[PDB]
From Swiss-Prot, chain A:
Gene: VCP
InterPro entries noted in UniProt: AAA+_ATPase, AAA_ATPase_CDC48, AAA_ATPase_domain, AAA_lid_3, Asp_de-COase-like_dom_sf, ATPase_AAA_core, ATPase_AAA_CS, Cdc48_dom2
Biological-process GO terms, alphabetical: aggresome assembly; ATP metabolic process; autophagosome maturation; autophagy; cellular response to arsenite ion; cellular response to heat; cellular response to misfolded protein; cytoplasm protein quality control
Keyword line: Acetylation, Amyotrophic lateral sclerosis, ATP-binding, Autophagy, Charcot-Marie-Tooth disease, Cytoplasm, Disease variant, DNA damage, DNA repair, Endoplasmic reticulum, Hydrolase, Isopeptide bond, Lipid-binding, Methylation, Neurodegeneration, Neuropathy, Nucleotide-binding, Nucleus, Phosphoprotein, Transport, Ubl conjugation, Ubl conjugation pathway
N6-acetyllysine modified-residue sites: K481, K484, K647, K728
Native organism: Homo sapiens
Outcome following mutation: R74G: In IBMPFD1; cultured cells expressing the mutant protein show a marked general increase in the level of ubiquitin-conjugated proteins and impaired protein degradation through the endoplasmic reticulum-associated degradation (ERAD) pathway; shows strongly reduced affinity for ADP and increased affinity for ATP; abolishes enhancement of K-294 methylation by ASPSCR1; decreased interaction with CAV1 and UBXN6
Span list, region Disordered: 687-701
Highest rank taxon of the organism: Eukaryota
Effect of E284Q: Defect in ubiquitin-dependent protein degradation by the proteasome
Catalytic activity annotation: ATP + H2O = ADP + phosphate + H(+)
Record PTM Phosphoserine, positions in chain: S16, S441, S681, S744
UniProt name for this protein: Transitional endoplasmic reticulum ATPase
Amino acid sequence: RPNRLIVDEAINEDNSVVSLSQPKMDELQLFRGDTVLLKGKKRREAVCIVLSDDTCSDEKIRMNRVVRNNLRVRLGDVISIQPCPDVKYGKRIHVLPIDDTVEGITGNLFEVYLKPYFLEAYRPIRKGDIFLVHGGMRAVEFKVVETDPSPYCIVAPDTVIHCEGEPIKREDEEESLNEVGYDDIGGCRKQLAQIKEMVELPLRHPALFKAIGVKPPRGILLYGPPGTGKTLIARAVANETGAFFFLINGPEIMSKLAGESESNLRKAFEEAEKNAPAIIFIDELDAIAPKREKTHGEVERRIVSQLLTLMDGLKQRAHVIVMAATNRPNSIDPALRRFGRFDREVDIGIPDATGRLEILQIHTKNMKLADDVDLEQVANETHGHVGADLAALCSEAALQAIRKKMDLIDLEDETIDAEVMNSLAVTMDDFRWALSQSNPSALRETVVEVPQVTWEDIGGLEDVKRELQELVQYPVEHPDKFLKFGMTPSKGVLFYGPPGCGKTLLAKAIANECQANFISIKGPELLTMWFGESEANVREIFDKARQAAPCVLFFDELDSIAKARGGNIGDGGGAADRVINQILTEMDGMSTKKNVFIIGATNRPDIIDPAILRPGRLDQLIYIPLPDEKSRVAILKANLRKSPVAKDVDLEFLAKMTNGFSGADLTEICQRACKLAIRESIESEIRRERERQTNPSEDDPVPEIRRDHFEEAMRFARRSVSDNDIRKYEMFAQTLQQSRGFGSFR
Amino acid sequence: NGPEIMSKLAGESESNLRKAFEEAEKNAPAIIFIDELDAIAPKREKTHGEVERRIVSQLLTLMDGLKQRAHVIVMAATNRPNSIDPALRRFGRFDREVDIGIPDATGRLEILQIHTKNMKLADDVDLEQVANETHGHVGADLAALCSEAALQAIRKKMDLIDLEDETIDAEVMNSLAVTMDDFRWALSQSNPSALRETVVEVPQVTWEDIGGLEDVKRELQELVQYPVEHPDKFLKFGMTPSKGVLFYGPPGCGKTLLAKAIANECQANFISIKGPELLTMWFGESEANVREIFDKARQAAPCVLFFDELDSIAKARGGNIGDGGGAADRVINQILTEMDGMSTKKNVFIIGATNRPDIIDPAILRPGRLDQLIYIPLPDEKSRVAILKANLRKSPVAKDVDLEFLAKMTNGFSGADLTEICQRACKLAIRESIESEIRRERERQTNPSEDDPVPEIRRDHFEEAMRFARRSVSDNDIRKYEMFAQTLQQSRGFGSFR
Ligand SMILES: C[C@@H]1CN(C(=O)Cn2ncc(-c3cc(F)c(OCc4nnc(SC5CCCCC5)n4-c4cccnc4)cc3F)n2)C[C@H](C)O1
Ligand SMILES: C[C@@H]1CN(C(=O)Cn2ncc(-c3cc(F)c(OCc4nnc(SC5CCCCC5)n4-c4cccnc4)cc3F)n2)C[C@H](C)O1
Ligand SMILES: Nc1ncnc2c1ncn2[C@@H]1O[C@H](COP(=O)(O)OP(=O)(O)O)[C@@H](O)[C@H]1O
Ligand SMILES: Nc1ncnc2c1ncn2[C@@H]1O[C@H](COP(=O)(O)OP(=O)(O)O)[C@@H](O)[C@H]1O
Ligand SMILES: Nc1ncnc2c1ncn2[C@@H]1O[C@H](COP(=O)(O)OP(=O)(O)O)[C@@H](O)[C@H]1O
């Protein structure tokens, strides 16, 4: 029945598009772009435009917040559709801006923020419709008051659109619920989806939770580095679901009189309870409830008990949800970590490489960014920047664009608003500055991310690409077989081989394949823990992996702790040590987590204590050898990929001449070749500038890495592994290997 | 519950607690339960002042102020009461301190059964795989997993549940039928609350699982089951039963398995403090934590406190030679000191395990302490056959394989590496099965559009696994154990004159 469908989040938006599935649109009687005539809840309909994408699943209908708020529909609701593929034009379309969105910007809004949207964008034009256009550095929205066709009309230059007048006030009877929502959350889509599936039912469906019986999460402990969006995601999941959001940020209450602040918190909870669907969000819970024994006295504990008696005092039949924001909740009171008060503790974490792109896209919506800017180089370069840093970079670029145009902006008495605001056009040249003049907030936190190094990048090693794909992808794709033969899947793999041979690359590729997070604790971090007499910090790292999705917790450069103290011989102590022992102890806990696939990497395995390479722990040894001829050819081609290269070079000859070079030093050879090529190119460029400046007053002296550049780089090459070192790895492999081919009798 | 009172005005919270006790007393059979007693009465010297101690004294004067003729019982809840005020640990106030502990493997099954009563669980779900997989989950985690599975079942049926104005209650609630596919998700999306606490449990590895070693199955059944079944004889001949046994032998030869089987036989708790835990205590300069572990065994029922991989502390610092220090160290010395206290507990049967005994300080292997040495040798021919059959049990196996030939070819492989051979065979068999399954899927997808290419671990899989086998003990290492055994052994058969 195509009449009714359940709404869902849209990704294409365009301020107008409603996304269906063609195998479903055929039932909906729409093919390419036919009008939808979307039917709302109370007393309104929208024309909308039909389109499709991947996430439809032939089950759900997707609408951006413009349509959802226009139709008085919250995400997760059920709505109706009245398909009508017909074309009808209007002549008296009149629109007025919304004072809530225009309260200090004055100009020709019919021309400054309207021209690029009233044609070819297919606005949901219909009397009473409200639409956002996202103009000059502000999410300006308008309402079309009169549309003489209805409920559908052609959005085309044939239809006549008239000029507006003075701004009108927003309808306080409904408030339009603009605020924020899911569409302006980026870089934490998985965490936002987890929160949605965790909190949507109790807030949208409080009626069933009085009958269904099963207790939903009374409180959700959002946490992450400051400025990660905890407040933003909380407010989005509040407004998007229609739940009343009560912010009781810690300092606002801790600053009040002792005893009176307790009353303030209690009456905040009472305010949340008086209306069923409300949610109360406790920002900066570290201040409110830090470690109990680390508090001084009076308020710092008077609140905590007062909080606890209210945190679990609620019966959960009032439909009140207590979300909280903290930083690595190891700091908050352990008493709050109990169940019935905070039973779910999603980790937002810093945005990853491709999440910062989305954050920039959403924040750089109204800036009217120039065409030469890409926002993908900026996202990649902003490594460690938290979403707050991305917003700060956005604002800094905007301010510099204003400040590089203050000469022609202050012509009249300072700013007159006016169309001039569109001229800014923040080019890359301003982003570069903002990025270089902003300090990452969270640069010293283990970043959980899905690495974007695919199987193709790691050429050469092939038996290990299939001997490693097995352990990871077989017990997930067909777990039924593994529970039949009785074997427990091996949640442990350590790569031992010559230094710099793709261990990190192989682990990252494994993470990439099964869309899995990749937490690399490099050797220097383990040395920091060992030297610092803080091996307990290891407990956090493993926990950081546990709270995440399927995670290849990768101990890069393992055995560095032992390598830093001679090893099994040459030192008074034995093989075991602080950090390795703590890793061993905590690993056995994550031997039953069935999502984490602990990986190790070692450049010198024989010093590793054998206590870890036994069943349950990193039992499965894998040997990656130094690349062979064909493998070296593959590595050369793969690591020179994404860089210009001439047809003259034949990588087969280089590979065979590359007799005994590992992956790291082979990529070093490629980097030296590229370095010499860029030096030649820049020298030719400055020489061409010299010619330009002199009397005479062919533009590509070296448009790719030339062959003799590779010649010179190879002449400048260097190898890091000797015959004895490479033989040592195979000799060690003989320890857990055998040549018992004699027992051929089955 | 503590916070409900600690949140009230100082002096007025004292009155609230006092009137709570008065309410308990006004009716004789009432009992008062103090939840989160850590907040109410933490360590006295670690409190700051005012309420945190004003309550405690106010509690103490009421905890023992009751005459016990009013029939009021004051139960309390705490976490490892080493944290609560020691003054409350005195007698006449808290004289019995039972330890609930986390549910064991078979207890989580019952917890799931009771919590999954009203969910109307589907038929394909078993609740025993879920219980086994939920290792470390506390009962609260089991309830959370229950609720998460229920919520996912609702959420995978919200499409046909919100047909009317949201939920109309109605019969539809029976349709949920939370299948395993939802439990799997809930289990994978829940973090164990208590995963770093020594778990007291009755292990479910019976005598049958540990094949081969037989003289030790009867030389170990003796010390454990004779002084409990017929204690009258032991108090007649005068000998005190030996509450100590250390297993020394090649690494990975069933020491942990033998200790677990001993625990299983006499329905006894089994606290294994593996070598890495003792190294954590030694490195951390926190040998006092050992005092807790022994206490954790004392408060439990008959308990084989098992020091798995003992001597790891000495193995981590060279040993008796190669290091400036002597045989003794922090953790081993603390274990020795605390063990003498539990030499008169007559329920605990401290067990040790060592892969390299000669480095162990001999201070522990003398009367009262782990005096009785037991040698488990590397398995022999028949013993290797038994081990093969026992560790391939509970897994499909073909009739083609004849384990006698594998065992004899398995000339010098220990128990651990022999089970490793079996695991490699099963790994290759599962790889072959999954490869055949994906190939069959390929055939299904292509034009043509016999369902058991490999329904058991086949024989050539064992062939290849044995070709991929590996041994962890050499001739010198195995001879070292018997040479050490000669230290406390003799060949004095000359004195045949009675
Ligand atoms: C008592 C015991 C058990 N026993 C049994 O008879 C029952 N039994 N037989 C098999 C299983 C089983 C266990 C699992 F833990 C499991 O996990 C799947 C999984 N899900 N997500 C990931 S993440 C993966 C890697 C990183 C992120 C990207 C993708 N993995 C994953 C991947 C790789 C390795 N390990 C887990 C699946 C299973 F089938 N239980 C008897 C035996 C003698 O002893
Ligand atoms: C002064 C002294 C004594 N003396 C005497 O003449 C008097 N005397 N003679 C014998 C005993 C005696 C002592 C015990 F401690 C005891 O304990 C029984 C027990 N109960 N539960 C378990 S747990 C068991 C193991 C783990 C959990 C699963 C089941 N065990 C147990 C098991 C194995 C080993 N040890 C205890 C029984 C006794 F008979 N007293 C003179 C002498 C020279 O010196
Ligand atoms: N994931 C995100 N998506 C979009 N904006 C974000 C995100 N995280 C942070 N921000 C930006 O950082 C600012 C602070 O947001 P938030 O972290 O929710 O509050 P707080 O910094 O007080 O915790 C907001 O103005 C918001 O625009
Ligand atoms: N196909 C490949 N095989 C091996 N190494 C590669 C390949 N492609 C690139 N590399 C280079 O190998 C390096 C990874 O080194 P890695 O082996 O992780 O060091 P370690 O062995 O110390 O962990 C990267 O710097 C990368 O440039
Ligand atoms: N009958 C048996 N005898 C010996 N070992 C067995 C037997 N059955 C299984 N095993 C294997 O022995 C291993 C136990 O090793 P264990 O001897 O406890 O190591 P350690 O000697 O270091 O304590 C288990 O992993 C198990 O798979």
